[PDB]
Amino acid sequence: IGSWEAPSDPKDAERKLAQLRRDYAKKVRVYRKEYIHEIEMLRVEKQRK
């Protein structure tokens, strides 16, 4: 993974800021969704057991 090249132009950190906000939030949210579904899968397996 490459997540570099944040400082490029004089005084416009909003690049990596947009990165942070949308990129990272949506990343973690996606991961969390996955986790919800997969773990509830595990649970229903335990019930079938």
Partner: protein
């Protein structure tokens, strides 16, 4: 807000962190829900590096919605389950070695 976090766990001047799912307004060493393994931050000799974490439950607690702190991202990305830190921007220039 369950803050999956890292509390100091050791002798003076040579510590050893530990991974525990806490509560926010609980003390640093306070009432934990459960530890989650360990993370020794000391460089070693077998593989002269650091060690330590656990898996298979950080999934569950992330799913139920823990917002942890970035000194824990420094591990929960280095072992997967996360994206890299969105503050991995640059690197100090000029490291020099001669041994």
């Amino acid at each position: 807000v369950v803050r999956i976090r890292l509390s100091r766990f050791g002798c003076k001047n040579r510590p050893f962190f530990r991974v525990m799912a806490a509560d926010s307004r609980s003390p640093r060493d306070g009432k934990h829900l459960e530890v989650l393994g360990y993370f020794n931050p000391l460089p070693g000799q077998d593989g002269g590096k650091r060690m330590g974490l656990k898996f298979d439950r950080i999934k569950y607690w992330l799913s139920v919605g823990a917002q942890p702190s970035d000194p824990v991202q420094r591990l929960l990305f280095r072992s997967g389950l996360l994206p890299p830190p969105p503050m991995v921007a640059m690197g100090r220039k000029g490291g020099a070695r001669d041994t």
